[PDB]
Amino acid sequence: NGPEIMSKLAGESESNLRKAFEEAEKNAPAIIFIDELDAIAPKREKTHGEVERRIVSQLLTLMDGLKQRAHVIVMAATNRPNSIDPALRRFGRFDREVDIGIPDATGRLEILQIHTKNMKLADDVDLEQVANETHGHVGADLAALCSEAALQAIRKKMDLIDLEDETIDAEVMNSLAVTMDDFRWALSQSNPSALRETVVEVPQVTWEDIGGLEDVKRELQELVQYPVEHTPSKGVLFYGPPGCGKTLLAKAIANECQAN
Amino acid sequence: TNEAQMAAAAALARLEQKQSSQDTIRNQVRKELQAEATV
Numbered sequence: 001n002g003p004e005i006m007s008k009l010a011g012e013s014e015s016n017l018r019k020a021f022e023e024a025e026k027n028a029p030a031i032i033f034i035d036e037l038d039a040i041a042p043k044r045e046k047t048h049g050e051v052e053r054r055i056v057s058q059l060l061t062l063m064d065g066l067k068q069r070a071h072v073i074v075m076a077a078t079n080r081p082n083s084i085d086p087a088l089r090r091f092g093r094f095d096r097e098v099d100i101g102i103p104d105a106t107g108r109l110e111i112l113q114i115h116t117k118n119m120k121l122a123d124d125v126d127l128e129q130v131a132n133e134t135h136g137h138v139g140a141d142l143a144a145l146c147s148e149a150a151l152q153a154i155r156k157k158m159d160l161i162d163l164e165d166e167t168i169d170a171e172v173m174n175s176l177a178v179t180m181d182d183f184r185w186a187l188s189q190s191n192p193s194a195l196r197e198t199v200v201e202v203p204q205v206t207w208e209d210i211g212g213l214e215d216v217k218r219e220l221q222e223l224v225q226y227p228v229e230h231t232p233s234k235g236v237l238f239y240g241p242p243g244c245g246k247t248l249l250a251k252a253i254a255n256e257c258q259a260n
Numbered sequence: 261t262n263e264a265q266m267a268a269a270a271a272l273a274r275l276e277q278k279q280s281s282q283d284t285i286r287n288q289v290r291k292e293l294q295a296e297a298t299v
């Protein structure tokens with residue numbers, strides 16, 4: 001990770017970076033994960049220090065060395081593809097990229113179900129409703145949500161149980177359930193990290209939500225079906241009076257096609 | 261001699277196979293036939 005290398009002095013920094021690559025070869029097959037890529041290799045034209053520019057060059061040479069370091073794959077994480085030195089994204093090196101994005105309403109429910117695997121839930125807990133309301137939350141936000149709900153449930157009972165020892169009795173933990181009041185409380189304290197970002201997901205608007213326009217619905221289905229059965233058209237313009245459902249039509253066709 | 265004449269036929273045949281309107285027209289029709297078959 002960036003901070004681990006950048007906190008080091010000149011020489012020690014570059015040494016630790018290239019040493020990790022050598023270890024991966026010795027232990028191949030291996031994966032080298034470089035977190036905060038924008039911190040380890042910031043754009044050279046955006047820095048003044050010699051240490052930062054040298055580290056960028058050192059990472060670039062280490063990526064090229066992968067032609068000899070057989071079975072070593074290097075993965076990196078950044079916030080934006082445009083926050084790193086463009087040399088890293090040239091053919092070779094990091095020439096494959098994946099946009100992780102923000103979990104959708106279904107994924108958020110699945111994430112909550114994963115975090116509650118060890119949690120006893122009360123009958124009033126509805127994680128699907130929570131996942132629908134938690135817009136702008138990412139997996140690390142839902143992890144904090146479950147943790148806060150767990151701690152609230154613990155405080156309510158432990159203040160009366162009075163178990164003061166080095167170990168916790170399995171029985172009193174096993175009987176402890178987290179209720180809707182504990183999730184609601186945690187929701188009021190949680191603060192989404194991805195609220196200002198755009199969320200892209202499959203819409204829930206279907207054709208039954210649009211009144212009228214029977215011929216428009218059929219025409220839109222032909223647009224998406226013809227490119228598969230058969231230059232096929234890849235778009236359509238909605239024009240006409242306002243307030244007739246132009247947005248709903250675009251969502252409904254995405255819904256039925258299971259498209260984002 | 262005759263052994264070289266058989267090598268001559270092989271060299272000329274490979275040159276013609278590498279240089280090669282009829283297969284371009286047939287291949288363009290074949291592509292349109294498959295699209296009309298499934299549409």
Ligand SMILES: Nc1ncnc2c1ncn2[C@@H]1O[C@H](COP(=O)(O)OP(=O)(O)O)[C@@H](O)[C@H]1O
Pocket residue numbers: 209210211212213242243244245246247248
């Ligand atoms: N064909 C329709 N059937 C039912 N409701 C509609 C229709 N067209 C518009 N509406 C109502 O108008 C509102 C705005 O529709 P929307 O498509 O979001 O507007 P725009 O496309 O201009 O952004 C919707 O909330 C919906 O309730």
